[PDB]
């Protein structure tokens, strides 16, 4: 849907079937999915020493 | 959130005004917009039932 | 649902596509290997209070 931008009375909205870009035929599925890169190496303090 | 190695099956349908054979919303009609006070951006509406 | 975003007393109504090319103004889809453009003006003209 597309909502038309009247400078009109504010009590009403008119919606029209939007035509739309081709992407939206499957952006309607890919809303639920995100992709991430693992960062498997990390550092943190504790009280130990390497032996020398 | 759940991690997964692959998506569910997504079918490459093509259409303009109405979305066909795609996935239905879980409980109720859901309506999605990028920034709803902007007329240039389409509202996507996803149904709960199909309509045949 | 639209009533939640725009407010309960809004007189929401639908209308058909305004004008321009067949490909952008109509349903533009394939059935069975054949390409259909269909005039959705029958669906989109309800009005609500």
């Amino acid at each position: 849907l597309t909502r038309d931008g009247g400078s009109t009375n504010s009590t009403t909205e008119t919606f029209r079937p939007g035509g739309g870009d081709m992407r939206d035929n499957w952006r309607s599925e890919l809303y639920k999915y995100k992709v991430v890169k693992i960062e498997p190496l990390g550092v943190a303090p504790t009280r130990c020493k390497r032996r020398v | 959130v759940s991690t997964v190695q692959c998506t569910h099956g997504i079918k490459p349908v093509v259409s303009t005004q109405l979305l066909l054979n795609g996935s239905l919303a879980e409980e109720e009609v859901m309506i999605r917009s990028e920034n709803i006070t902007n007329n240039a951006k389409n509202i996507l509406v996803q149904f709960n039932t199909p309509v045949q | 649902q639209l009533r939640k975003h725009f407010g309960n007393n809004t007189i929401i109504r639908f209308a058909n596509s305004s004008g321009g090319d067949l490909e952008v103004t109509t349903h533009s889809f394939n059935c069975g290997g054949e390409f259909f453009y269909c005039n959705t003006s029958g669906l989109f003209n309800s009005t609500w209070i």
Epitope: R3, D4, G5, G6, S7, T8, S10 | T37, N38, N39, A40 | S18, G19
Partner: antibody
Amino acid sequence: QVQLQQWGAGLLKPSETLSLTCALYGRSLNGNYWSWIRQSPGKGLEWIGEINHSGSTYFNPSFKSRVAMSVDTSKSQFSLKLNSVTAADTGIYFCARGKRYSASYSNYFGVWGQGTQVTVSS
Amino acid sequence: DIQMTQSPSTLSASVGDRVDITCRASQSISRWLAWYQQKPGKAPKVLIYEASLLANGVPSRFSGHFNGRESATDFTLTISSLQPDDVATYYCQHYMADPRFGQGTKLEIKR
């Protein structure tokens, strides 16, 4: 019912400041921007800028160095001031209703005042 | 900035004729255009907005046309059956950015 009326200075000498008042009837300024537009026979129509009930503004770049606008939501009024007028500022000036706040692409001017004629001469 | 070119500059036709006025944006305006009628010595009045919708109180003989696609540049106002009252100056105007009017077209009736 919704309308505006406007008035102010008719004759100005060069380098003076123009000042014009616009008053609404039958509604408040909220929910819309408001603008001034002017006509001169050498240029057709020019948009000057815009204001709102919050008194924030945005101005057409060529005017931003000379223009000011103000609002008075208690009187249902807004106004325009234009510094350092020259013969080229001669014309008819109209205040008009602009875009509505909940529709970011709606800046086309639905209602206009009767307009006022400004002559800039000695 | 984005600027509007009208064509023709002046026009004449007789009562009951169709009349067409055109406007072209200097680059694509997605559909954010309006048309105005000005009587001599009066404020303009809006006729059409979003290139194609009628304003309220416009007689249904007025109409807008354009190719509909989101990259449009070329727009038309068609007076589908001219009447004695339609003698006026007509301006297009975009609102993609700052509002810019076209130079206006004048229509005078043949009798």
